[PDB]
Amino acid sequence: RDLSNIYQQCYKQIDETINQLVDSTSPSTIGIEEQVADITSTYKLLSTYESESNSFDEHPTPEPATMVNNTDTLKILKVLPYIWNDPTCVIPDLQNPADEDDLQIEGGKIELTCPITCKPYEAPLISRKCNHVFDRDGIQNYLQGYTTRDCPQAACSQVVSMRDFVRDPIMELRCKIAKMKESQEQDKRSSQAIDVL
Amino acid sequence: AKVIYVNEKDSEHQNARELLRDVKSRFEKEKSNQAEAQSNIDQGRKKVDALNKTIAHLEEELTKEMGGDKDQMRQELEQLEKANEKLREVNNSLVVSLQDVKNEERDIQHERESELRTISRSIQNKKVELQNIAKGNDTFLMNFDRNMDRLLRTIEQRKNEFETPAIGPLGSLVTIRKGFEKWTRSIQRAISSSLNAFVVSNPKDNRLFRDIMRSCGIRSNIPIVTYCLSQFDYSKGRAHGNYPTIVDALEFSKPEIECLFVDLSRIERIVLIEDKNEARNFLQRNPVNVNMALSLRDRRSGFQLSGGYRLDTVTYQDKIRLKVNSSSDNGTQYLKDLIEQETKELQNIRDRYEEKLSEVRSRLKEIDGRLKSTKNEMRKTNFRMTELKMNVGKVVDTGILNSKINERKNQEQAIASYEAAKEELGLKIEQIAQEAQPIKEQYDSTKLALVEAQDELQ
Amino acid sequence: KTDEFLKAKEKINEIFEKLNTIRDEVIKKKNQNEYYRGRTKKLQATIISTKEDFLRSQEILAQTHLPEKSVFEDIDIKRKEIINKEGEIRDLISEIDAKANAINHEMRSIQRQAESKTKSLTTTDKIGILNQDQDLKEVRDAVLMVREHPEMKDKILEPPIMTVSAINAQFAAYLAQCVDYNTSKALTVVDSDSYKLFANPILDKFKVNLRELSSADTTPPVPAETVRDLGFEGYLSDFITGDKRVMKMLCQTSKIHTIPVSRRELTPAQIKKLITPRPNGKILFKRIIHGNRLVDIKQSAYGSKQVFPTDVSIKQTNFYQGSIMSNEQKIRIENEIINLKNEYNDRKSTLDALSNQKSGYRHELSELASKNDDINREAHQLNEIRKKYTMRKSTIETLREKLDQLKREARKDVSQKIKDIDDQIQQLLLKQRHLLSKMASSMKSLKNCQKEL
C-alpha cells in the first residue's frame, strides 16, 4: 500500500516555479541572493524528504539515509547571481563549484554569438567534457555522429565518445536580462534627449 | 502488452496548456485594447467639450457689437434712402407752398398799393379843386373839364364874338335854386352837354367855335349848344314831375331860358325819388310827362332809373357843375367832415387784406418748422447709416480668435474615427472570445482525463 | 475511529492548485508588462513625431511675414478719409438741395414766361381791363359770375368794352363817343328784352349799368351806299370785331346802329338835308362817329324840325381793349420786362446748370471717394492677407501649446505604471516562496502515519 508519485509531481511543481523565476526579475531588482538561498532551502529540503520517503521503499524510527546531494540537476540554481553581474560571464559548472576559473573566463571570447556564423545561440546543446556547442547548424553534417576524432575545431584536447549534445538551459538566460538592461539605457537616453524640448 | 504503456499520455497536458495560454492571452490582450479605445475616446471627447463653446462665448462679446444684425444693418440703406427722397419731396412741397403764398402776398400787395392811395386821392381831389388857385393843378372850373378854366376865362373877353351873342355858357344863365343841396350830388352824371357849351346862330356854324383854343393852353375841343335868349313855343306840353324838377329847382339870371329844358333830350325829366324802390312807385305812369329819376343806395351812392322800373347804377361823386349861390364853398362842413369820415376806407380795405395775409403767413410757420425737422432728420439718418462705415469699416477681427476653431472642429472627426474603430473592436473581442472559451473545453477534458491507478493485476 | 488519515490528503492538492493560480497570475502579469511596453512603443512614436512637427512649425516663424503697428493704425488713419467721404456727401446733399430749391424758384418764372408767350399777341382773356379800380374789380367779379351764369351770358354777354376788339385803340375809337364810357361798361344784351330777364345781379350784387333799345326798325340802317357821302368809309358794326349779337346789342340801345366809320375827321354835315320831320320810321341823322371827335344832332317831337347842336371829342385812352394798344404800351410795360426776364431766365437756368456742374465735380469726387474706398478695400485685401498669416501663426502656436501638454503628460502618465507591475512582481515573488514553504511544511502529517496507520 503506497502513494509515491505525488511527490515527483511536487518536484515538477517546484521545478516549474524555478522556470517561472528564472526570467521574471524586473530591471529594478537589486540582488537576488536571498531569493537564491530560499529556493536552495526549499529544493534541498524536498531532496531530504525524498530520502525520508524512500526509507520505507526497502520495506517508526528507520535507518539513517546518509545520501548527499551530488546530482546534476542541482546546477539549475548555482549560476543566477553571475548572470545578474554582467554579460561577460561564462558559468556552466559541471566540474568547478565556482566560476569558470573560479572568478574569470580567460578562455577565448567565444560568446553568446556563434564562433563563425556569428549569431546568438538559439538552439544549443553542450557536451559534458568539451563544452562544444552547436545548434545543429551548418556544422550539422560534416562527419556528424563519428566520435573518434576531428570534432569541428582544430587541435582539441581529447578523443570523444558518442553522446551527441545534451541539455543546458543557461544559454539564453544571460542574454535575456543583459539585452533588457542594455536596451533600457538606450530607451531612457533617446527619451530624455527630446522629452520636453 | 499493457505493461506501462500510456504513462506518456500526459503529453496531452502540454498541448492543452499551450492552447489555454494562447486563447487566454488573445482574449485578455484584445479586451485591454478595447478598454484602451474606450478610455481614449472618452478622455478626448471630455477634452474637447471642455472648450467647445468657451471660444464661441468669449468671441461673442465684441462680436455681438457687430452681431447677427448684419442683414438689417446692411439693408438699412434702403429705408434710409426712402426717407431721404420723401423728405426732399415733402420739403419741395413746403417750399412750393411758401413761395406761392409769398406770390399771393405780393399780388395782394400790388392790389392795395395800386388802389387805396389812388382812389382816396381821386375822391379827395374835390377839395383841392375847391380851394386851389394856381395854373395847371385842379381848379373850380374843371367841373366840365380840367383846363375848362382857361377857355371860360378867355371867353370872359370873347363872350359875344360869333354869329350870334353868347353872354353865358348857360351855367350862369341857369343855376340850381337856393337850398337844393341834396338834389345836386349827381348833376354831372345827370346832365352832360347843355351846361358845357356855347350858343351860335344856326347850323351853318358847326365849324365855327371849335378852334380858338390857341390862347392859353386849353386841353380839349368843347361842345356847342345853342338856344336863343328868349321863350319859345308854349303850344306844347310843359312837364312837371312829382318833386321839384329841373324846372322848379332852378335859379335864373336870364329867366327866359326856361323853354329849352323841355326841348332837351329828356335829361331835364329827372326827379330824385329817395330810395331805389321808392322810384319804383309811380314813374311807371310817368306823371305829367317825366321819364328819368334818381334813387338812393346809401347816403353816398345810388341808382339811375327810367320808365318806372328801369334801373342802372353809376358813379356818384361830389362834383358841382354850375355857378351857384349854393356854391362848392357852401357845403364845406360836409366836404370836410364826410371826407375825414370816409378816408377810413384807406385803412379798412388795407386791414381786410393783411388779416388774411397774416393768417396765411402764420400758417407758413408750421411748414417752416417741419422743414427744419426734416433737415435735422437728414443728419439723424446720416449718423444712423454711419453704422455701415462702423461695422463694414471695422474689419472682422475675430480671426485671431477663430484660429483655435479648426482643431476644436477636427478633434470631433478624430473622435468619430476612434468610435468607428471601437464599434468594430468591441465585437472583434467577442468573436475572439467565441474562438477561445469553447476551446477551453478541450483543456478541461485533457485535465480531466489524467486519472488511472497502479495495481497488481494481470 | 473511522478511517485513519486517508481523509487528510486534500490539503496538498489544494495548495498545489493555489501554486498553479500563482503561476497563472505570473503569466498574466508578464503579458501586462509586454502590453505596457507596447504602450511605451506608442508613446515613443508619438514623441518622435511631435518633436519634429514642433521643430518645423517653430522654424515657420523664421520667415519675414513682417507685421507692423499698421495692423490697426491704417484702419484708424483711413477713419478720417471715410469721414472726408461723409463730409463730401453732406456737402453734395446741400448742393442738390440748392439745385431743387433753384428748380422750384425757376418753375414759377417758367410758368410766367409761358403765359407771356401766349400773351405775345391779341388778348388771351378780356378780363384784364378791369384790374385798375375797385368798382372795376366789382365788374371783374360780375364777369366771373356771368361766366358762372351761362344762361345770363348767352342772353346778356360780357360788356361791349370787353368783347369788342380792333387793330388799335384808335380803331377801337369807332365805338368810343357814340356811347359814353359809363354806358360802355354795361353787359352786352343779345336781344332787347333780356334786360328785364337778367338785370338783377349786375345792378345789385355789383354796381354797373345796362340799357334798352330806342327803336326797332330792323332794316338796312342807312339809306344805301350813297350814305358814304362825306367820304364815310363804311359799316360800323362790322368794322369793329366781335360777336354778331354783341354787334346788334348797342344798335339803338345806345344809338350806334346807323353810324358810318371813317378815319377822316368828318362831321354830320347833312344837317341842311333834314330841316323836315323826316322820320320815315328812322332817326338816322342824330349821331355818327368820325375820326376822333363827334357831333350830335337832335330830333324833338315838340320841335318844328330846326335842330340845335351838341358835340364831344373822342379820347384816346384805356377803353375797348382787344389788347394793351396792340403793341405800343405793352412793348414797354410787359414786353421789355418779360424779355429782360427771359434773359434772366436763361441766365438763372444756366446758373442752376453751373450749380449742377459744381455738383458734377463733387459727383466725380464721390465716385473717386468710393473708388479710393475700394482701393482701401484692396488694402483691406492686404489686411486680410496679413490677418490670415496671423491666423496661420496663431494656429501653429495652438498646435505647439497642444504638443507642450501632450509631451508632458505622455512622458509619465502611463509609463509610471511600471511601478505597479514591479509591485505585482514583488507580490508574486513573496507568494510563490511562502506558499512553497507552506506546501513543504505539511510533511510528516503525511502517509508517514504508520504509527497508527
CSV table of N, CA, C and O in Angstrom, one decimal, chain B residues 17 25 32-33 36 88 95-96 103 111 115 119 189 203-204 206 210 223-227 236-237 263 265-266 269 276 297 303 309-314 349 378 382 389 393 395 397 399 402-404 407, chain C residues 20 23 27 31 35 39 42 75 82 86 93 97 100-101 104 108 134 137 180 182 195-196 203-204 207-211 267 271-272 295 298 300 302 308-311 313 380 383-384 387 391 394-395 398 402:
chain,number,residue,atom,x,y,z
B,17,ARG,N,-2.2,23.0,-22.3
B,17,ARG,CA,-1.8,24.2,-21.6
B,17,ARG,C,-1.4,25.3,-22.6
B,17,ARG,O,-1.6,26.5,-22.4
B,25,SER,N,-4.5,34.6,-23.5
B,25,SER,CA,-3.7,35.8,-23.8
B,25,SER,C,-4.3,36.6,-24.9
B,25,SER,O,-4.4,37.9,-24.8
B,32,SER,N,-8.1,44.4,-23.3
B,32,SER,CA,-7.4,45.5,-22.8
B,32,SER,C,-7.3,46.6,-24.0
B,32,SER,O,-7.4,47.8,-23.7
B,33,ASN,N,-7.2,46.1,-25.2
B,33,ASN,CA,-7.2,47.1,-26.3
B,33,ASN,C,-8.5,47.8,-26.5
B,33,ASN,O,-8.5,49.0,-26.7
B,36,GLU,N,-8.7,50.3,-23.8
B,36,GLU,CA,-7.8,51.5,-24.2
B,36,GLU,C,-8.6,52.4,-25.2
B,36,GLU,O,-8.6,53.6,-25.0
B,88,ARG,N,-37.0,115.0,-49.1
B,88,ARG,CA,-36.7,116.0,-50.1
B,88,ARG,C,-37.9,116.4,-50.8
B,88,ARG,O,-38.2,117.6,-51.0
B,95,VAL,N,-41.7,124.3,-49.7
B,95,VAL,CA,-41.2,125.5,-50.3
B,95,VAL,C,-42.1,126.0,-51.4
B,95,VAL,O,-42.3,127.2,-51.6
B,96,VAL,N,-42.7,125.0,-52.2
B,96,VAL,CA,-43.8,125.4,-53.2
B,96,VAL,C,-44.9,126.2,-52.5
B,96,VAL,O,-45.3,127.3,-52.9
B,103,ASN,N,-46.1,134.7,-53.3
B,103,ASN,CA,-46.6,135.3,-54.6
B,103,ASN,C,-48.0,135.9,-54.3
B,103,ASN,O,-48.3,137.0,-54.8
B,111,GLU,N,-52.2,144.9,-55.2
B,111,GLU,CA,-53.7,145.2,-55.2
B,111,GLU,C,-54.0,146.4,-54.4
B,111,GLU,O,-54.6,147.3,-54.8
B,115,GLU,N,-54.5,150.7,-55.5
B,115,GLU,CA,-55.9,151.1,-55.4
B,115,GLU,C,-56.2,152.1,-54.3
B,115,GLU,O,-56.8,153.1,-54.5
B,119,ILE,N,-57.4,155.8,-55.2
B,119,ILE,CA,-58.8,156.2,-55.1
B,119,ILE,C,-59.0,157.2,-54.0
B,119,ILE,O,-59.9,158.1,-54.2
B,189,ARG,N,-73.4,163.2,-63.6
B,189,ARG,CA,-74.0,162.0,-64.3
B,189,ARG,C,-75.4,162.2,-64.7
B,189,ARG,O,-75.9,161.4,-65.5
B,203,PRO,N,-77.2,176.2,-87.8
B,203,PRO,CA,-76.3,175.1,-88.1
B,203,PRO,C,-75.2,175.3,-89.1
B,203,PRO,O,-74.3,174.5,-89.2
B,204,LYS,N,-75.2,176.5,-89.7
B,204,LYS,CA,-74.1,176.8,-90.6
B,204,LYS,C,-72.8,176.9,-89.7
B,204,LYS,O,-71.7,176.8,-90.2
B,206,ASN,N,-71.5,175.0,-87.5
B,206,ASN,CA,-71.0,173.7,-87.0
B,206,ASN,C,-69.5,173.9,-86.8
B,206,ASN,O,-69.0,173.7,-85.7
B,210,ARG,N,-65.0,175.9,-82.9
B,210,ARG,CA,-64.2,174.8,-82.5
B,210,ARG,C,-62.7,175.1,-82.1
B,210,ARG,O,-62.3,174.6,-81.1
B,223,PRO,N,-67.9,171.5,-76.4
B,223,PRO,CA,-69.2,171.4,-77.2
B,223,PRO,C,-69.7,172.7,-77.6
B,223,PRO,O,-69.3,173.8,-77.1
B,224,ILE,N,-70.7,172.7,-78.5
B,224,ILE,CA,-71.5,173.9,-78.9
B,224,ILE,C,-73.0,173.5,-78.7
B,224,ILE,O,-73.5,172.6,-79.3
B,225,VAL,N,-73.7,174.3,-77.9
B,225,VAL,CA,-75.1,174.1,-77.7
B,225,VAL,C,-75.8,175.5,-77.8
B,225,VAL,O,-75.3,176.5,-77.2
B,226,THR,N,-76.9,175.6,-78.5
B,226,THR,CA,-77.4,176.9,-78.9
B,226,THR,C,-78.9,176.9,-78.7
B,226,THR,O,-79.7,176.1,-79.2
B,227,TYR,N,-79.3,177.9,-77.9
B,227,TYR,CA,-80.7,178.3,-77.8
B,227,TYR,C,-80.7,179.8,-77.6
B,227,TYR,O,-79.9,180.4,-76.9
B,236,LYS,N,-97.0,173.5,-76.5
B,236,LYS,CA,-96.9,172.0,-76.3
B,236,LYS,C,-96.6,171.8,-74.9
B,236,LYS,O,-96.4,172.7,-74.1
B,237,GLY,N,-96.6,170.5,-74.5
B,237,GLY,CA,-96.6,170.1,-73.1
B,237,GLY,C,-95.4,170.6,-72.3
B,237,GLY,O,-94.3,170.5,-72.7
B,263,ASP,N,-87.4,171.0,-74.2
B,263,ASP,CA,-86.9,170.6,-75.5
B,263,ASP,C,-85.6,169.8,-75.5
B,263,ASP,O,-85.3,169.2,-76.5
B,265,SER,N,-83.1,166.6,-74.3
B,265,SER,CA,-83.2,165.2,-74.7
B,265,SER,C,-83.9,164.3,-73.6
B,265,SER,O,-83.7,163.1,-73.6
B,266,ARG,N,-84.7,165.0,-72.8
B,266,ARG,CA,-85.4,164.4,-71.7
B,266,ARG,C,-84.4,164.1,-70.5
B,266,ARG,O,-84.9,163.5,-69.5
B,269,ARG,N,-86.0,165.7,-67.6
B,269,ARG,CA,-87.0,165.0,-66.9
B,269,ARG,C,-86.5,164.0,-65.9
B,269,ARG,O,-86.7,162.8,-66.0
B,276,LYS,N,-84.3,153.3,-53.9
B,276,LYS,CA,-84.3,152.5,-55.1
B,276,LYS,C,-85.7,152.1,-55.5
B,276,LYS,O,-86.2,152.3,-56.6
B,297,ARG,N,-78.8,154.3,-52.9
B,297,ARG,CA,-78.3,153.1,-52.4
B,297,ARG,C,-77.8,153.2,-51.0
B,297,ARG,O,-78.1,152.4,-50.1
B,303,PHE,N,-78.7,155.0,-57.6
B,303,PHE,CA,-79.1,154.4,-58.9
B,303,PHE,C,-79.7,155.5,-59.9
B,303,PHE,O,-80.2,156.5,-59.4
B,309,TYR,N,-89.3,151.4,-63.7
B,309,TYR,CA,-88.6,150.2,-63.2
B,309,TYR,C,-87.2,150.1,-63.7
B,309,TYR,O,-86.4,149.5,-63.0
B,310,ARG,N,-86.9,150.6,-64.9
B,310,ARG,CA,-85.6,150.5,-65.4
B,310,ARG,C,-84.6,151.1,-64.5
B,310,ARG,O,-84.8,152.2,-63.9
B,311,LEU,N,-83.5,150.4,-64.3
B,311,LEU,CA,-82.5,150.7,-63.2
B,311,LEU,C,-81.1,150.6,-63.8
B,311,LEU,O,-80.8,149.7,-64.6
B,312,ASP,N,-80.2,151.4,-63.2
B,312,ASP,CA,-78.8,151.4,-63.5
B,312,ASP,C,-78.1,152.0,-62.4
B,312,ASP,O,-78.6,152.9,-61.7
B,313,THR,N,-76.8,151.5,-62.1
B,313,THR,CA,-76.0,152.0,-61.0
B,313,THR,C,-74.8,152.7,-61.6
B,313,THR,O,-74.1,152.1,-62.5
B,314,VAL,N,-74.5,153.9,-61.2
B,314,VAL,CA,-73.5,154.8,-61.8
B,314,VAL,C,-72.5,155.2,-60.7
B,314,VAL,O,-72.6,154.8,-59.5
B,349,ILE,N,-59.9,148.7,-46.1
B,349,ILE,CA,-59.6,147.7,-47.1
B,349,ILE,C,-58.2,147.1,-46.9
B,349,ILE,O,-57.9,145.9,-47.1
B,378,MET,N,-32.3,114.6,-41.6
B,378,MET,CA,-31.2,114.3,-42.6
B,378,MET,C,-29.9,113.8,-41.8
B,378,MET,O,-29.4,112.7,-42.0
B,382,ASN,N,-28.0,110.3,-41.2
B,382,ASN,CA,-26.6,110.2,-41.6
B,382,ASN,C,-25.9,109.5,-40.4
B,382,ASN,O,-25.1,108.5,-40.7
B,389,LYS,N,-20.3,102.3,-42.2
B,389,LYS,CA,-18.8,102.5,-42.1
B,389,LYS,C,-18.3,102.1,-40.7
B,389,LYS,O,-17.1,102.0,-40.6
B,393,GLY,N,-16.6,99.1,-42.0
B,393,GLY,CA,-15.3,99.7,-41.9
B,393,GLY,C,-14.4,99.0,-40.9
B,393,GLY,O,-13.2,98.8,-41.1
B,395,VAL,N,-12.9,95.9,-39.7
B,395,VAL,CA,-12.6,94.6,-40.2
B,395,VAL,C,-13.0,93.6,-39.1
B,395,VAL,O,-12.8,93.9,-37.9
B,397,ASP,N,-12.4,91.3,-36.7
B,397,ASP,CA,-11.1,90.9,-36.0
B,397,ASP,C,-11.2,89.6,-35.3
B,397,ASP,O,-10.4,89.4,-34.4
B,399,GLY,N,-10.6,86.8,-36.3
B,399,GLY,CA,-9.7,85.7,-36.9
B,399,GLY,C,-8.7,85.3,-35.9
B,399,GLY,O,-8.4,84.1,-35.7
B,402,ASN,N,-10.8,82.9,-34.2
B,402,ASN,CA,-11.2,81.7,-34.9
B,402,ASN,C,-10.0,80.8,-35.2
B,402,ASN,O,-10.2,79.7,-35.7
B,403,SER,N,-8.7,81.3,-35.0
B,403,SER,CA,-7.6,80.4,-35.2
B,403,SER,C,-7.7,79.1,-34.4
B,403,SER,O,-7.2,78.1,-34.9
B,404,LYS,N,-8.4,79.1,-33.3
B,404,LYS,CA,-8.5,78.0,-32.4
B,404,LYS,C,-9.6,77.1,-32.8
B,404,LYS,O,-9.8,76.0,-32.1
B,407,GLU,N,-9.0,73.2,-34.9
B,407,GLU,CA,-8.7,72.0,-34.1
B,407,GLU,C,-9.9,71.5,-33.3
B,407,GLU,O,-10.2,70.3,-33.2
C,20,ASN,N,-0.6,26.8,-8.7
C,20,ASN,CA,-0.9,26.9,-10.1
C,20,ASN,C,-1.6,28.2,-10.4
C,20,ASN,O,-1.3,28.9,-11.4
C,23,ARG,N,1.0,30.8,-10.6
C,23,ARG,CA,1.7,30.7,-11.9
C,23,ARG,C,0.8,31.4,-13.0
C,23,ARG,O,1.4,32.1,-13.9
C,27,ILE,N,2.0,34.6,-15.4
C,27,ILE,CA,2.0,34.8,-16.8
C,27,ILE,C,1.1,36.0,-17.2
C,27,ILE,O,1.4,36.7,-18.1
C,31,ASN,N,2.4,39.3,-19.3
C,31,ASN,CA,1.7,39.7,-20.5
C,31,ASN,C,1.3,41.2,-20.4
C,31,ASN,O,1.5,42.0,-21.3
C,35,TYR,N,2.4,44.4,-22.6
C,35,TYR,CA,1.4,45.3,-23.1
C,35,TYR,C,1.8,46.8,-22.8
C,35,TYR,O,1.6,47.7,-23.7
C,39,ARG,N,2.7,50.1,-25.0
C,39,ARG,CA,2.3,51.5,-24.7
C,39,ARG,C,3.6,52.4,-24.8
C,39,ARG,O,3.5,53.5,-25.3
C,42,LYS,N,4.3,53.1,-28.4
C,42,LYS,CA,3.4,54.1,-28.9
C,42,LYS,C,3.8,55.5,-28.5
C,42,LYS,O,3.8,56.4,-29.3
C,75,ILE,N,-6.3,101.3,-40.5
C,75,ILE,CA,-7.7,101.5,-40.4
C,75,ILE,C,-8.1,102.7,-39.6
C,75,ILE,O,-8.9,103.5,-40.0
C,82,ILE,N,-12.7,108.2,-44.6
C,82,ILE,CA,-14.1,107.9,-44.7
C,82,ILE,C,-14.9,109.0,-44.2
C,82,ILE,O,-16.0,109.3,-44.6
C,86,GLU,N,-17.8,111.3,-45.8
C,86,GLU,CA,-19.1,111.7,-45.3
C,86,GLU,C,-19.3,113.2,-45.4
C,86,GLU,O,-20.4,113.7,-45.7
C,93,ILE,N,-25.1,116.8,-50.7
C,93,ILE,CA,-26.6,116.8,-50.4
C,93,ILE,C,-27.1,118.2,-50.3
C,93,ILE,O,-28.2,118.6,-50.8
C,97,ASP,N,-29.8,120.0,-52.7
C,97,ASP,CA,-30.9,120.7,-52.1
C,97,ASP,C,-31.0,122.1,-52.7
C,97,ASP,O,-32.1,122.6,-53.0
C,100,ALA,N,-32.6,121.7,-56.1
C,100,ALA,CA,-34.0,121.6,-56.1
C,100,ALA,C,-34.7,122.9,-55.8
C,100,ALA,O,-35.7,123.3,-56.4
C,101,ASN,N,-34.1,123.7,-54.8
C,101,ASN,CA,-34.7,125.0,-54.5
C,101,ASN,C,-34.6,125.9,-55.7
C,101,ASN,O,-35.6,126.7,-55.9
C,104,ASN,N,-37.3,124.9,-58.2
C,104,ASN,CA,-38.6,125.5,-57.9
C,104,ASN,C,-38.7,127.0,-58.1
C,104,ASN,O,-39.7,127.5,-58.5
C,108,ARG,N,-41.8,128.8,-61.3
C,108,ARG,CA,-42.7,129.9,-61.4
C,108,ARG,C,-42.4,130.9,-62.5
C,108,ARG,O,-43.3,131.3,-63.2
C,134,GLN,N,-61.4,149.7,-57.9
C,134,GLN,CA,-62.2,148.8,-57.0
C,134,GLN,C,-63.5,148.5,-57.7
C,134,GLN,O,-63.9,147.3,-57.7
C,137,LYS,N,-63.0,146.2,-60.3
C,137,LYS,CA,-62.9,144.9,-59.8
C,137,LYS,C,-64.2,144.2,-59.4
C,137,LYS,O,-64.4,143.0,-59.6
C,180,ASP,N,-71.2,156.6,-74.1
C,180,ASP,CA,-70.3,157.1,-73.0
C,180,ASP,C,-69.6,155.9,-72.4
C,180,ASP,O,-70.0,154.8,-72.4
C,182,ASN,N,-69.2,155.3,-69.2
C,182,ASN,CA,-70.0,154.8,-68.2
C,182,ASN,C,-71.1,153.8,-68.7
C,182,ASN,O,-71.3,152.7,-68.1
C,195,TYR,N,-82.8,142.5,-70.9
C,195,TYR,CA,-82.6,143.4,-69.8
C,195,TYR,C,-83.5,143.0,-68.6
C,195,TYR,O,-83.0,142.8,-67.5
C,196,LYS,N,-84.8,143.0,-68.8
C,196,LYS,CA,-85.7,142.7,-67.7
C,196,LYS,C,-85.5,141.3,-67.2
C,196,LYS,O,-85.7,141.0,-66.0
C,203,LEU,N,-76.7,144.9,-61.2
C,203,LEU,CA,-77.1,146.2,-60.7
C,203,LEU,C,-77.3,146.2,-59.2
C,203,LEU,O,-77.3,147.3,-58.6
C,204,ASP,N,-77.4,145.0,-58.5
C,204,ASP,CA,-77.5,145.0,-57.1
C,204,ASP,C,-76.3,144.3,-56.4
C,204,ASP,O,-75.7,144.9,-55.5
C,207,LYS,N,-72.4,147.0,-59.1
C,207,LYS,CA,-72.9,148.3,-59.4
C,207,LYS,C,-72.4,148.8,-60.8
C,207,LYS,O,-71.4,149.5,-60.8
C,208,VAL,N,-73.0,148.3,-61.9
C,208,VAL,CA,-72.8,148.9,-63.2
C,208,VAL,C,-74.1,149.0,-64.0
C,208,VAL,O,-75.1,148.6,-63.4
C,209,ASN,N,-74.0,149.4,-65.2
C,209,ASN,CA,-75.2,149.9,-66.0
C,209,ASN,C,-75.7,148.8,-66.9
C,209,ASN,O,-75.0,147.8,-67.2
C,210,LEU,N,-76.8,149.1,-67.5
C,210,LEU,CA,-77.4,148.4,-68.6
C,210,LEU,C,-78.3,149.4,-69.4
C,210,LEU,O,-78.6,150.4,-68.9
C,211,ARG,N,-78.7,149.0,-70.6
C,211,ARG,CA,-79.6,149.9,-71.4
C,211,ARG,C,-80.5,149.1,-72.3
C,211,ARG,O,-80.4,147.9,-72.4
C,267,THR,N,-68.0,165.0,-90.2
C,267,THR,CA,-69.0,165.6,-89.4
C,267,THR,C,-70.4,165.3,-90.0
C,267,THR,O,-70.5,165.1,-91.2
C,271,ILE,N,-77.0,168.2,-92.1
C,271,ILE,CA,-78.0,168.9,-91.3
C,271,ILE,C,-79.0,169.6,-92.2
C,271,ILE,O,-80.2,169.5,-92.0
C,272,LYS,N,-78.5,170.3,-93.3
C,272,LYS,CA,-79.4,171.0,-94.2
C,272,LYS,C,-80.3,170.1,-95.0
C,272,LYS,O,-81.3,170.5,-95.5
C,295,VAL,N,-70.0,165.0,-83.4
C,295,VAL,CA,-71.1,166.0,-83.3
C,295,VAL,C,-72.4,165.2,-83.1
C,295,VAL,O,-72.5,164.1,-83.5
C,298,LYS,N,-80.2,166.4,-82.7
C,298,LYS,CA,-81.4,166.0,-82.1
C,298,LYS,C,-82.6,165.9,-83.1
C,298,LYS,O,-82.4,166.4,-84.3
C,300,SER,N,-86.6,166.5,-82.1
C,300,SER,CA,-87.5,166.6,-81.0
C,300,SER,C,-89.0,166.4,-81.5
C,300,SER,O,-89.3,166.9,-82.5
C,302,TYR,N,-91.6,167.7,-80.0
C,302,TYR,CA,-92.2,169.0,-79.9
C,302,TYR,C,-91.7,170.0,-80.9
C,302,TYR,O,-92.4,170.9,-81.3
C,308,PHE,N,-80.7,172.0,-83.0
C,308,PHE,CA,-79.7,172.7,-82.3
C,308,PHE,C,-78.5,171.8,-82.0
C,308,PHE,O,-78.7,170.5,-81.8
C,309,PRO,N,-77.3,172.3,-81.8
C,309,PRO,CA,-76.1,171.5,-81.9
C,309,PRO,C,-75.7,170.8,-80.5
C,309,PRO,O,-76.2,171.2,-79.5
C,310,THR,N,-74.8,169.9,-80.6
C,310,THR,CA,-74.1,169.3,-79.5
C,310,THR,C,-72.9,168.5,-80.0
C,310,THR,O,-73.0,168.0,-81.1
C,311,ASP,N,-71.9,168.4,-79.2
C,311,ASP,CA,-70.6,167.8,-79.7
C,311,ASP,C,-69.8,167.3,-78.5
C,311,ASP,O,-69.9,167.9,-77.4
C,313,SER,N,-65.6,165.3,-78.0
C,313,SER,CA,-64.5,164.7,-78.7
C,313,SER,C,-64.3,163.2,-78.2
C,313,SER,O,-64.8,162.8,-77.1
C,380,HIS,N,-7.5,96.4,-47.7
C,380,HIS,CA,-8.1,95.5,-46.8
C,380,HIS,C,-7.9,94.1,-47.3
C,380,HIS,O,-7.9,93.2,-46.4
C,383,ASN,N,-4.9,93.5,-45.8
C,383,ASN,CA,-5.1,93.4,-44.3
C,383,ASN,C,-5.6,91.9,-44.0
C,383,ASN,O,-5.1,91.3,-43.1
C,384,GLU,N,-6.4,91.4,-44.9
C,384,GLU,CA,-6.9,90.0,-44.7
C,384,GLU,C,-5.7,89.1,-45.0
C,384,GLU,O,-5.6,88.0,-44.4
C,387,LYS,N,-3.8,89.2,-41.8
C,387,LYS,CA,-4.6,88.6,-40.7
C,387,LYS,C,-4.8,87.1,-40.9
C,387,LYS,O,-5.0,86.3,-39.9
C,391,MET,N,-3.5,84.3,-38.7
C,391,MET,CA,-4.4,83.1,-38.4
C,391,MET,C,-3.4,81.9,-38.5
C,391,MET,O,-3.4,81.2,-37.6
C,394,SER,N,-1.0,81.9,-35.4
C,394,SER,CA,-1.7,81.5,-34.1
C,394,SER,C,-2.1,80.0,-34.1
C,394,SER,O,-2.1,79.4,-33.1
C,395,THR,N,-2.4,79.5,-35.3
C,395,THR,CA,-2.7,78.1,-35.4
C,395,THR,C,-1.5,77.2,-35.0
C,395,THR,O,-1.6,76.2,-34.3
C,398,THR,N,-1.1,77.3,-31.4
C,398,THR,CA,-2.1,76.4,-30.7
C,398,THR,C,-1.6,75.0,-30.8
C,398,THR,O,-1.7,74.2,-29.9
C,402,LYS,N,-0.4,72.7,-27.7
C,402,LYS,CA,-1.1,71.4,-27.5
C,402,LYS,C,0.0,70.3,-27.3
C,402,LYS,O,-0.1,69.5,-26.4
